[PDB]
Amino acid sequence: SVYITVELAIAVLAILGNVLVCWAVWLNSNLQNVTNYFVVSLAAADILVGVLAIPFAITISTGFCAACHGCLFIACFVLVLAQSSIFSLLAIAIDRYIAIAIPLRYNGLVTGTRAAGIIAICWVLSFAIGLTPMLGWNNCGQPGCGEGQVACLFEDVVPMNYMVYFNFFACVLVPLLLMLGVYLRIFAAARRQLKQMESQPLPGERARSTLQKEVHAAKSAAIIAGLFALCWLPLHIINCFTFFCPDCSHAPLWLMYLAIVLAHTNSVVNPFIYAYRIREFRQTFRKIIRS
Numbered sequence: 001s002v003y004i005t006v007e008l009a010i011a012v013l014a015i016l017g018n019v020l021v022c023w024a025v026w027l028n029s030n031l032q033n034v035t036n037y038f039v040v041s042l043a044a045a046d047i048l049v050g051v052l053a054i055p056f057a058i059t060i061s062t063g064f065c066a067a068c069h070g071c072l073f074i075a076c077f078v079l080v081l082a083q084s085s086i087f088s089l090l091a092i093a094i095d096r097y098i099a100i101a102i103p104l105r106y107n108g109l110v111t112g113t114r115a116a117g118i119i120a121i122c123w124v125l126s127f128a129i130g131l132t133p134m135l136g137w138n139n140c141g142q143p144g145c146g147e148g149q150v151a152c153l154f155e156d157v158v159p160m161n162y163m164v165y166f167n168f169f170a171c172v173l174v175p176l177l178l179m180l181g182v183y184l185r186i187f188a189a190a191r192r193q194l195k196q197m198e199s200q201p202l203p204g205e206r207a208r209s210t211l212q213k214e215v216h217a218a219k220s221a222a223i224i225a226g227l228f229a230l231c232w233l234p235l236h237i238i239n240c241f242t243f244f245c246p247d248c249s250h251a252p253l254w255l256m257y258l259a260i261v262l263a264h265t266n267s268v269v270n271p272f273i274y275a276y277r278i279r280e281f282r283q284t285f286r287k288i289i290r291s
């Protein structure tokens, strides 16, 4: 009952953490910029983790009896909160690039309306993809509970070719390669901006201070994105060994859940990574708590 306790501990932190973030964005209007619109999506997503994803993962770990629809949802719900966080983290990457690359067209393109528009689309695509196994890509009844109910054991109810080719490579590895590819252009150009501002006949520390505050936000966004891959790769890497190499000793359970716990921990780093990186956030929280 240790894994249960640990999973329950993360559930609390994942709620309190991201809920606190959603509150600070509501109170302090200095955080209600188009950028943090996606951050809220990342928060809400990482809230449902400690609200449904984890409660589901703890239930499906022991396995239960239910229809294919009810079983797949409880099995592929985490794939929704994981996919949404991909779009949120991707947008934040693009966004931070737009600000540094084209600061002028930033306010013209990056609008508080298009943001809410893309987010909605991202969520819709997150359910279509994250719940593709529910469309037909499943192992329900492939060569106890009785007719009508299927032993809801994930590895038995959800394919591996999907978790690898479709989910991992295409819906995780590729994005994280675009994201990393984006940050490559960000800091590469950001340091060029500082070099051009190095041959200017005037001080203009305003464009510098603003540039260093745009980079300080693009870097903070890089650390948020970086922690995602750092907390999901282990789980996927494990599934690449089991699939591509049937011979390779199927990963142990004591090491399997660790890659699962690590994936639920990612939902908690975001709140704490704001209170540290962004000085504007920590002061906002500090006020909420006291009062």
Ligand SMILES: CCCn1c(=O)c2[nH]c(-c3ccc(OCC(=O)NCCN)cc3)nc2n(CCC)c1=O
Residues within 6 Å of the ligand: 003, 057, 060, 061, 062, 074, 075, 076, 078, 154, 155, 163, 168, 235, 236, 239, 253, 254, 256, 257, 260
């Ligand atoms: C790309 C990842 C694909 N993928 C998995 O490979 C996976 N594996 C397990 C999984 C779950 C429980 C296990 O043992 C529980 C146990 O006995 N613990 C004892 C601790 N002392 C083993 C494996 N859940 C998984 N899910 C999530 C499905 C909702 C998933 O999406």
